[PDB]
Amino acid sequence: ARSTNTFNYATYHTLDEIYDFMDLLVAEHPQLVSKLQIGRSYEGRPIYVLKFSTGGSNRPAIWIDLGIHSREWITQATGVWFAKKFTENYGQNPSFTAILDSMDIFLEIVTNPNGFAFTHSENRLWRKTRSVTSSSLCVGVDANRNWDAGFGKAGASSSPCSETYHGKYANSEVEVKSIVDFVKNHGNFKAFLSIHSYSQLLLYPYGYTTQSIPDKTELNQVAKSAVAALKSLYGTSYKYGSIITTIYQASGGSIDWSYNQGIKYSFTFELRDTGRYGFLLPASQIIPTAQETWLGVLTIMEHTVNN
Ligand SMILES: CS(=N)(=N)C[C@@H](Cc1ccccc1)C(=O)O
Ligand SMILES: [Zn+2]
């Protein structure tokens, strides 16, 4: 509340809280974290990215977004945890410090602020954005299906009322477009990670095509290692593979797009529980999830700095 050491990482928070948390963090470690606004949500809410850097001009960076799907609260929770973790581990953890000394980290905790606010105010299970209009009384698009990666292909719905509505056109959603422009403009992103929320999977590109990525051998081993690392804390078991192969076909996905942009280390993480609690994960599981997930993330980051 008053400082980042007082903030309760063991509970779920509102939009305001996370935003306030953002400012505390920047106030406390001004030389390491900066708060950037890459856009405004459909309902005009600021879209913020927290930039962790030790200097340099335009260093190779790591992209990390959480809460694209509003109801997946564990991700926003894990998001805030990571942010504090970055400030804590710099200069203490030999490996993490090595990473920050050479690369920057872009962390977007609340990728979909409108839906997030909605999950607090009216429907806890809301997952889409809150954009309106058309020949429909239904609101929102599935932000993870609005990307220009086999956009509109099988694995997404053209029906606005649908939970997996892809939107009118690729990048129609500001929350999405804001990232695209940011990342395209930066031009030196090396890794791109998108965090979900439930089923315990480590996925790597192509949800939209059966086509195998050229870097499949390498991506597969990294995922193997990441999953191995993650399970070392509490023995949480994750499955890994390509999207289409492990789950099902999905078009307009975040990770397919990033990979197509030449960002090789494109992985999607699906926390935490395999259905017992689902999207309504007990707050008591926040830390543990954050802790383990971090191990898998750092694994991937280490690979990145090394290749
Ligand atoms: C449980 S869920 N809705 N997070 C599953 C998440 C699986 C996915 C990962 C990457 C890319 C496209 C699809 C989705 O359907 O968006
Ligand atoms: Zn999701």
Side-chain angles (χ1 to χ4, degrees):
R2 291 200 259 185
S3 82
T4 75
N5 303 124
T6 271
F7 183 96
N8 183 358
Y9 301 91
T11 199
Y12 289 113
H13 302 275
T14 67
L15 188 284
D16 315 77
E17 300 176 327
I18 292 173
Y19 276 18
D20 284 338
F21 164 94
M22 288 171 98
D23 293 332
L24 285 179
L25 197 67
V26 186
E28 299 168 11
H29 299 280
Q31 265 47 307
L32 200 64
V33 33
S34 328
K35 179 178 69 167
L36 313 184
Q37 184 178 153
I38 62 172
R40 302 168 70 253
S41 78
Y42 178 80
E43 308 185 331
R45 300 179 174 82
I47 292 174
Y48 303 124
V49 168
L50 280 185
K51 171 187 174 181
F52 302 78
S53 176
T54 72
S57 344
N58 198 75
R59 281 180 167 153
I62 312 295
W63 175 266
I64 316 174
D65 66 74
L66 306 96
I68 208 159
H69 285 142
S70 50
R71 64 183 181 185
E72 304 166 18
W73 281 18
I74 194 42
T75 73
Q76 290 94 348
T78 297
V80 174
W81 191 88
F82 276 7
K84 173 60 177 185
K85 183 67 173 179
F86 304 153
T87 57
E88 287 184 330
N89 266 30
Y90 182 76
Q92 304 296 124
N93 173 54
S95 195
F96 180 73
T97 154
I99 293 156
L100 265 204
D101 274 336
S102 294
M103 313 191 61
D104 296 342
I105 311 164
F106 290 86
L107 182 81
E108 189 177 357
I109 310 167
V110 189
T111 291
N112 173 198
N114 295 170
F116 187 62
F118 195 82
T119 66
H120 278 277
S121 171
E122 271 8 290
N123 178 7
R124 177 57 179 79
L125 289 220
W126 187 257
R127 51 135 40 179
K128 296 197 284 172
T129 65
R130 297 295 294 167
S131 41
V132 313
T133 308
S134 170
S135 298
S136 170
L137 347 300
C138 289
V139 48
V141 180
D142 176 351
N144 200 32
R145 273 180 209 12
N146 191 238
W147 306 68
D148 200 11
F151 176 87
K153 285 194 203 309
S157 164
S158 76
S159 167
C161 300
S162 181
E163 279 291 79
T164 63
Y165 181 45
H166 58 49
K168 38 171 195 140
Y169 48 80
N171 303 138
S172 53
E173 295 319 270
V174 71
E175 305 79 355
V176 171
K177 186 37 155 52
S178 298
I179 302 169
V180 172
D181 290 347
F182 187 79
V183 177
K184 275 192 56 185
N185 285 349
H186 179 116
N188 208 19
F189 275 97
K190 303 288 91 175
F192 184 108
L193 283 42
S194 252
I195 319 291
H196 296 251
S197 211
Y198 129 64
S199 69
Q200 299 172 188
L201 302 177
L202 211 206
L203 282 14
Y204 54 71
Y206 305 147
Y208 83 87
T209 165
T210 52
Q211 182 215 310
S212 287
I213 61 172
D215 304 300
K216 220 268 246 37
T217 292
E218 182 174 9
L219 256 60
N220 199 254
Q221 182 61 39
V222 168
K224 197 195 174 178
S225 296
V227 158
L230 165 150
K231 178 187 176 69
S232 93
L233 263 201
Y234 311 102
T236 296
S237 293
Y238 271 61
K239 253 109 94 257
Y240 64 103
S242 69
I243 303 169
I244 191 171
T245 260
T246 87
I247 312 170
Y248 49 36
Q249 194 184 152
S251 58
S254 165
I255 286 301
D256 294 353
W257 177 83
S258 84
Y259 186 80
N260 283 349
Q261 302 313 298
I263 304 170
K264 196 198 310 155
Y265 304 115
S266 308
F267 300 93
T268 281
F269 274 79
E270 302 280 343
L271 283 34
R272 213 203 222 181
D273 139 316
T274 53
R276 208 307 165 157
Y277 299 106
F279 307 113
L280 258 58
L281 213 269
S284 60
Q285 294 197 223
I286 297 175
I287 312 278
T289 302
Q291 276 178 344
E292 67 196 9
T293 302
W294 156 251
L295 272 41
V297 171
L298 214 201
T299 296
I300 303 172
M301 282 178 173
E302 266 158 21
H303 183 80
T304 281
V305 81
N306 280 343
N307 304 278

